Design an enzyme around this catalytic site. Structure first.
Site, PDB file in Angstrom:
ATOM      1  N   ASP A 200      15.891   3.676  12.456  1.00 41.01           N
ATOM      2  CA  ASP A 200      15.038   3.345  11.322  1.00 41.01           C
ATOM      3  C   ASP A 200      15.908   2.994  10.109  1.00 41.01           C
ATOM      4  O   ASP A 200      16.538   3.881   9.522  1.00 41.01           O
ATOM      5  CB  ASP A 200      14.109   4.518  10.997  1.00 41.01           C
ATOM      6  CG  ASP A 200      13.090   4.181   9.920  1.00 41.01           C
ATOM      7  OD1 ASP A 200      13.281   3.184   9.193  1.00 41.01           O
ATOM      8  OD2 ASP A 200      12.097   4.921   9.796  1.00 41.01           O
ATOM      9  N   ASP A 257       8.067  16.556  15.816  1.00 44.48           N
ATOM     10  CA  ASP A 257       6.739  16.049  16.109  1.00 44.48           C
ATOM     11  C   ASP A 257       5.940  16.023  14.804  1.00 44.48           C
ATOM     12  O   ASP A 257       5.281  17.003  14.432  1.00 44.48           O
ATOM     13  CB  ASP A 257       6.049  16.911  17.169  1.00 44.48           C
ATOM     14  CG  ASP A 257       4.794  16.250  17.748  1.00 44.48           C
ATOM     15  OD1 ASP A 257       4.305  15.240  17.185  1.00 44.48           O
ATOM     16  OD2 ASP A 257       4.291  16.759  18.774  1.00 44.48           O
TER      17      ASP A 257
END
Length: 274
Positions: A200, A257
């Site tokens: 990213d 998560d």
């Protein structure tokens, strides 16, 4: 399933259309799998928090009519929580909860600096370049003029907002606010950049921006303490501002998560009779 429908709230009305996917990446999808009714309010980024608050209230009115629900559960990020706070303050009987995720609840040091850059306020050349290049990389990554979104997020502007809508703000810096005010529940989450991932391109840029804060614990856009509103759930995620909405397209820090933060919180809300 929550009793009251969940409304995900963010600034950047054109995000889904310009980027090609939702701001809260995969979030509404996972929440619906768990049986909750989920809606998304995408608010106008290039105006004041009060304008977004009014836009959100118009959204909520139409939604309450369509659902026959009496209240909503707000989950906002960045600009979102301030618009949520405007609605809860003025229309508390219509708001079950405000959950703030990395909200700019006390202003953005980066927005402050950006304002000095725009005003040509004696910012050294090398700093101007680092800040603008980082913002360029972030925007480019999403897309393929950003002062407009940051104007309303300076310390000066948010201090003024807080003066008008002081509900649930902490009494001591980095503290917690009241969980319940005017019968509305307030919760906060946050994060700050940690450790010394790479796929990213926004993370490297957020880390550039991170160095310019006086508050060392920050997510690239907001200091950890500035995020606080109502009861703290968790704020020590090793994630930047963008990571916390599962961007870019699920590329987050440290195999966390992120989606699970939201789905677990939804179950928490349901447990609170919300």
């Amino acid at each position: 399933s929550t009793k009251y429908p969940i409304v995900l709230v963010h600034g950047l009305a054109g995000f889904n259309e310009i980027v090609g996917f939702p701001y809260f990446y995969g979030i509404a999808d996972a929440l619906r799998q768990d049986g909750h009714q989920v809606f998304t309010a995408s608010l106008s980024a290039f105006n004041s928090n009060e304008v977004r608050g009014k836009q959100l209230w118009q959204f909520v009115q139409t939604l309450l009519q369509e659902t026959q629900a009496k209240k909503v559960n707000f989950i906002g990020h960045s600009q979102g929580p301030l618009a949520c706070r405007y609605v809860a303050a003025n229309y508390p009987d219509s708001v079950a909860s405000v959950t703030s995720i990395n909200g700019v609840n006390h202003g953005s040091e980066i927005a402050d600096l950006y304002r000095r850059i725009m005003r040509k306020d004696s910012i050294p050349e090398y700093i101007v370049e680092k800040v603008l290049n980082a913002f360029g990389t972030i925007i480019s990554t999403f897309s393929g003029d950003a002062i407009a979104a940051l104007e309303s997020l300076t310390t000066e502007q948010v201090t003024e907002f807080n003066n008008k809508y002081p509900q649930a703000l902490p009494k001591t810096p980095g503290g917690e606010g009241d969980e319940i005010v005017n019968g509305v529940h307030y919760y906060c989450f946050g994060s700050y950049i940690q450790g010394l991932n790479l796929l990213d391109p926004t993370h490297a840029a957020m880390r550039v921006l991170n160095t310019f804060f006086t508050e060392k614990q920050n997510d690239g856009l907001v200091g950890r303490s500035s995020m606080r509103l109502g009861k703290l759930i968790k704020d020590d995620y090793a994630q930047d501002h963008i990571d916390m909405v599962n961007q870019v397209a699920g590329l987050v820090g440290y195999n966390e998560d992120i989606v699970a933060i939201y789905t677990q919180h939804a179950k928490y809300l349901a447990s609170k009779q919300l």
